[PDB]
Amino acid sequence: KKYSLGKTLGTFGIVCEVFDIESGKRFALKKVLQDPRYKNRELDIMKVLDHVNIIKLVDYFYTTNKYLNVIMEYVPDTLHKVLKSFIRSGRSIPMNLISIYIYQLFRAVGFIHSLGICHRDIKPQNLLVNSKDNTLKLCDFGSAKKLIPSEPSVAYICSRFYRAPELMLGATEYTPSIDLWSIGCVFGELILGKPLFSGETSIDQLVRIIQIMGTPTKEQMIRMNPHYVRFPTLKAKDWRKILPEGTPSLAIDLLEQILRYEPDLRINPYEAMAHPFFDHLRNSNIPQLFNFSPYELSIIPGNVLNRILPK
Amino acid sequence: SKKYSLGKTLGTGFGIVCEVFDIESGKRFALKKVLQDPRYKNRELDIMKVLDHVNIIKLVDYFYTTNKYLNVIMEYVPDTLHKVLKSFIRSGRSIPMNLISIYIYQLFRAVGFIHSLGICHRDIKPQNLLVNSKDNTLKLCDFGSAKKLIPSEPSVAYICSRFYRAPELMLGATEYTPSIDLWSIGCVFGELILGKPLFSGETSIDQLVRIIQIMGTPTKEQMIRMNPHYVRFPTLKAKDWRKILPEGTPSLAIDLLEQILRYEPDLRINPYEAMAHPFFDHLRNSIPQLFNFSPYELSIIPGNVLNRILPK
Ligand SMILES: O=C1N=c2ccccc2=C1c1[nH]c2ccccc2c1NOCC[C@H](O)CO
Numbered sequence: 001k002k003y004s005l006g007k008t009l010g011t012f013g014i015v016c017e018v019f020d021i022e023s024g025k026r027f028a029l030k031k032v033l034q035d036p037r038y039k040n041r042e043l044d045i046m047k048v049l050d051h052v053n054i055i056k057l058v059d060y061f062y063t064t065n066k067y068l069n070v071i072m073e074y075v076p077d078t079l080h081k082v083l084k085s086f087i088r089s090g091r092s093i094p095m096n097l098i099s100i101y102i103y104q105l106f107r108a109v110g111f112i113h114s115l116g117i118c119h120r121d122i123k124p125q126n127l128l129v130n131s132k133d134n135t136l137k138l139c140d141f142g143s144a145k146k147l148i149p150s151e152p153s154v155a156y157i158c159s160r161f162y163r164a165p166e167l168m169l170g171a172t173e174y175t176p177s178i179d180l181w182s183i184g185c186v187f188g189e190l191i192l193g194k195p196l197f198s199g200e201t202s203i204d205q206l207v208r209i210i211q212i213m214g215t216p217t218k219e220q221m222i223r224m225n226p227h228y229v230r231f232p233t234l235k236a237k238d239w240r241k242i243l244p245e246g247t248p249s250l251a252i253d254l255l256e257q258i259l260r261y262e263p264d265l266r267i268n269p270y271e272a273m274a275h276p277f278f279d280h281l282r283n284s285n286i287p288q289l290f291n292f293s294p295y296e297l298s299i300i301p302g303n304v305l306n307r308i309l310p311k
Numbered sequence: 312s313k314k315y316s317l318g319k320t321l322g323t324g325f326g327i328v329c330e331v332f333d334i335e336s337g338k339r340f341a342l343k344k345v346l347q348d349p350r351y352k353n354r355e356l357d358i359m360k361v362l363d364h365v366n367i368i369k370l371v372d373y374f375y376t377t378n379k380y381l382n383v384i385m386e387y388v389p390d391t392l393h394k395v396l397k398s399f400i401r402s403g404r405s406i407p408m409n410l411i412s413i414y415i416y417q418l419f420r421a422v423g424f425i426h427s428l429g430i431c432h433r434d435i436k437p438q439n440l441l442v443n444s445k446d447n448t449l450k451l452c453d454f455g456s457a458k459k460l461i462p463s464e465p466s467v468a469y470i471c472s473r474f475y476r477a478p479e480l481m482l483g484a485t486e487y488t489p490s491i492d493l494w495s496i497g498c499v500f501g502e503l504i505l506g507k508p509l510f511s512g513e514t515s516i517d518q519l520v521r522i523i524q525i526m527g528t529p530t531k532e533q534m535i536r537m538n539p540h541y542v543r544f545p546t547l548k549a550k551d552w553r554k555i556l557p558e559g560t561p562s563l564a565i566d567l568l569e570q571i572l573r574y575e576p577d578l579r580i581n582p583y584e585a586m587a588h589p590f591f592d593h594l595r596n597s598i599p600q601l602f603n604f605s606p607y608e609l610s611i612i613p614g615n616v617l618n619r620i621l622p623k
């Protein structure tokens with residue numbers, strides 16, 4: 001009764017736009033089929049995400065088959081729709097804007113990773129954008145999990161475009177580092193205007209990665225998955241020959257630092273925020289970039305913080 | 312339900328209140344379990360959800376269970392002002408005025424916060440006032456009797472309780488205001504000083520007479536302000552608190568009490584102005600957090616008032 005129903009946004013349930021009958025405000029409703037016997041993992045993660053670049057939990061309740069109704073913060077557009085529109089119009093997303101989106105993405109992921117939480121399905125359909133601010137917010141934690149580093153996961157993550165290579169190799173001991181590969185993939189697509197690594201199967205997807213970044217060495221295979229083994233030998237290619245003809249060197253340098261085979265070697269989110277590619281954001285439309293919460297300040301290293309911040 | 316382990320009982324008041332433990336983090340919380348239909352809203356949860364303040368008990372978690380029950384997990388504080396009050400009497404000592412001021416200051420800050428939202432507690436009493444001994448932090452809990460007052464709509468006069476109701480409630484008022492909480496604070500302040508409650512009595516008349524016997528018969532203008540729908544008592548002159556309260560009592564204590572226990576609901580000192588009252592000049596001159604105002608708090612405290620509240 002408290003929420004009047006709006007447009008369906010996407011379909012174990014459905015996602016709608018709803019309105020608070022009392023305040024007038026607009027929120028997002030996720031209605032999922034659910035037994036009040038068991039916990040809901042997604043609700044349980046939501047409950048802990050209090051960050052400016054992450055979608056906030058507002059309310060939740062049960063209904064009538066029994067359903068859990070999660071009411072969340074709303075943002076009016078997805079990076080998927082923005083990206084498709086630029087292609088449609090015939091032009092490239094300005095690099096200045098790409099940097100704005102990608103910085104905020106890094107900030108979000110930095111925050112969930114300081115809690116051991118991994119998203120596992122970062123994609124442009126999951127990156128909410130505000131046209132008026134250029135604010136970006138990470139949503140949908142239906143596929144997320146708190147990784148317990150002393151404990152093995154089962155390899156059951158299948159998806160196009162954005163999986164880390166270690167997931168394609170059936171890794172059992174993957175880490176939140178997987179998200180960092182996704183960011184890289186999003187970042188590249190934004191630049192190129194189409195995804196980096198297509199393919200319907202894991203083999204297909206692996207081959208495409210190899211085709212661009214070269215065959216992984218043995219040391220690289222172990223570090224991705226020590227439980228797994230031979231491909232043909234292909235040399236790495238230069239991103240400057242893959243990406244479109246205008247692409248800034250700083251953009252490619254950061255990209256090189258993200259898309260590494262060795263999960264442990266991928267750039268740290270706060271490190272990436274301190275990367276010269278964001279130097280023009282530090283030199284003062286722009287949303288909030290430097291309003292760190294007292295939690296974030298407790299977590300960012302002092303060397304790093306000083307390089308992230310403006311003079 | 313597995314997430315929390317029981318759980319010493321804290322009070323069976325439509326449900327129970329227990330101590331519970333987060334089996335993942337090890338932290339201790341308070342569980343309020345109430346009999347509830349998931350067909351209706353629960354008013355108390357809806358209020359909890361909006362209370363974000365250092366001197367009010369925070370909501371933590373909530374879930375359903377099986378007769379169907381709503382389970383409210385809240386911030387926990389290990390003691391009540393009632394137990395503290397009731398222990399000082401045992402030892403044959405009075406609560407230091409310096410301590411009394413610590414608690415009552417925080418109480419005002421809490422009330423200041425809920426009234427900025429139109430939320431009225433409606434049952435403030437030392438049993439509802441949680442105190443932590445490490446720190447002298449006080450927190451206001453248990454909003455099961457709270458309501459958001461919609462100034463343009465009447466309420467129904469069905470509030471019956473001992474010691475702490477505003478005179479307007481005793482008079483069957485239908486248009487009462489969050490001011491009723493300030494009357495309760497005054498009473499609590501008073502009781503802390505005196506060693507026993509100010510206004511005893513099992514019925515409404517009984518409660519009114521006691522007030523009238525200390526504060527004097529209300530004038531006609533004071534009756535209209537408490538309840539313009541209500542008519543004679545015998546004429547009694549006000550007594551002077553200096554002769555009711557114990558021999559030592561500081562004059563600023565009484566000054567502050569006088570400014571809370573007015574018959575005219577609209578004249579009762581407002582909470583921020585009370586923190587500015589000189590009775591708290593020693594906390595300023597000189598103990599928990601007192602001056603760490605939230606961005607929200609800062610935006611609704613008036614300018615001149617704020618400066619009087621803060622230390623120099
Ligand atoms: O604002 C949103 N908050 C959410 C929380 C969880 C899941 C989705 C959203 C939100 C969406 N905002 C949008 C604005 C324009 C278009 C779509 C959306 C949102 N959701 O997208 C549908 C979910 C789909 O199944 C995968 O993301």
Ligand SMILES: O=C1N=c2ccccc2=C1c1[nH]c2ccccc2c1NOCC[C@H](O)CO
Pocket residue numbers: 321322328341343368385386387388389390391438439441452453454
């Ligand atoms: O810490 C508490 N949080 C609460 C939220 C709602 C209702 C009660 C409490 C809490 C109590 N903490 C205590 C510590 C010692 C003794 C009692 C309590 C709490 N409540 O006990 C029942 C409330 C009753 O109104 C007063 O006895």
